[PDB]
Design a protein around this ligand. Structure first.
Ligand code: HAH
Length: 331
């Protein structure tokens, strides 16, 4: 604070503005958070392994601290992924002899997991990401080949969405994914959510991760996604928004800060984005950034280990960037 407006305050009549957090920062940057955001997501501390490390042992301490942080300050909470190929302990898929678990073991284990997790924050979490990244990223492959698909069954998303809806039939359940604007994958996601809706599965929205960079997707490529998903009459949430200064499969490894060209493109590119989100504020009800400031971001270690990135509108010192001002809402 010193003379700058609240980012989430300027969108109060448009949509929530959230951030991906961690209990480690609730102390240091708790106030910066409680001022620009009215929604938050646990980046990792709420995933399978993080709260269900062993078959009979649960660990919710970190997650609880987050929810307690938010609800006290009138902030919304999105629960992140119940069913995902990553960050899921081995036991969940194994049997006594080290073999693979059966469809029945799978159904029981998943069921008890969902109840415990969704039920614990019942009526407190307004939105959940039941299934994360189920669609393949290879043009001629629909379903991503995973143990969920193999050991449980192709009807695993339905089960997930059904179980979740019982634990808290008031939460909005989303199907979350990335590359959602890629013309090919965009249709794969569309058909899945369409199949799900027909089968009667309780899906209430689609989760557009928003892991984009300063080059693409084009404004038209995003606009098309929005309209494509929005037509299914479901809510749209940009869930893991960030603007990478690199392209994926970027070989450039010597930057200590972004190139002047990178900053220019980004400031310009962010302005266009939120300008498009505002045009579509009817369809979009929540935009979350995968992080709070450039001081931290998973991009620093992925896909390149040890390569620092600056994907937000807040620099490494929690101070507003030139992109910040070109993004404040009309309210
Ligand atoms: O496998 C990928 C490949 C490219 C981009 C993103 C992903 C995964 N997308 C996200 C990354 C951050 C994690 O904290 C989130 O849980 C995850 O959903």
């Amino acid at each position: 604070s010193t003379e700058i407006p609240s980012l989430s305050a300027s969108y109060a009549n448009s949509f929530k503005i959230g951030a991906a957090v961690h209990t480690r920062m609730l102390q240091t940057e708790g106030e910066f958070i409680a001022k620009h955001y009215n929604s938050v997501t646990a980046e990792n501390q709420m995933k399978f392994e993080e709260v269900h490390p062993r078959e009979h042992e649960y660990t919710f301490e970190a997650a609880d601290e987050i929810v307690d942080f938010a609800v006290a300050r009138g902030i919304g909470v999105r629960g992140h992924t119940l069913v995902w190929h990553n960050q899921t302990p081995a036991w969940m898929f194994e049997d006594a002899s080290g073999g693979t678990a059966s469809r029945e073991m799978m159904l029981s284990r998943l069921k008890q997991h969902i109840d415990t997790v969704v039920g614990r924050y019942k009526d407190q979490i307004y939105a959940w990401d039941v299934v994360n990244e189920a669609i393949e990223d290879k043009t001629d492959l629909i379903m991503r080949d995973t143990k969920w698909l193999r050991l449980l069954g192709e009807d695993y998303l339905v089960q997930a969405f059904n179980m979740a809806h019982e634990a808290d039939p008031n939460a909005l359940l989303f199907y979350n994914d990335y590359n959602e604007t890629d013309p090919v994958k965009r249709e794969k996601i569309y058909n899945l959510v369409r199949s799900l809706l027909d089968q009667g599965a309780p899906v209430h929205g689609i989760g557009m991760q928003g892991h984009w960079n300063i080059h693409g997707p084009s404004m038209d490529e995003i606009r098309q996604a929005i309209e494509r998903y929005a037509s299914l009459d479901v809510q749209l949430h940009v869930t893991e928004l960030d603007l990478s200064v690199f392209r994926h499969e970027d070989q450039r490894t010597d930057l200590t800060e972004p190139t002047a060209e990178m900053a220019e493109l980004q400031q310009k590119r962010y302005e266009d984005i939120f300008g498009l989100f505002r045009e579509y504020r009817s369809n979009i009800t929540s935009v979350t950034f995968w992080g709070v400031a450039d001081n931290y971001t998973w991009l620093d270690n992925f896909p390149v280990r040890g390569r620092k990135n600056w994907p937000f509108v807040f620099d490494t010192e929690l101070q507003p960037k030139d992109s910040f001002w070109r993004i404040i809402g009309q309210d």
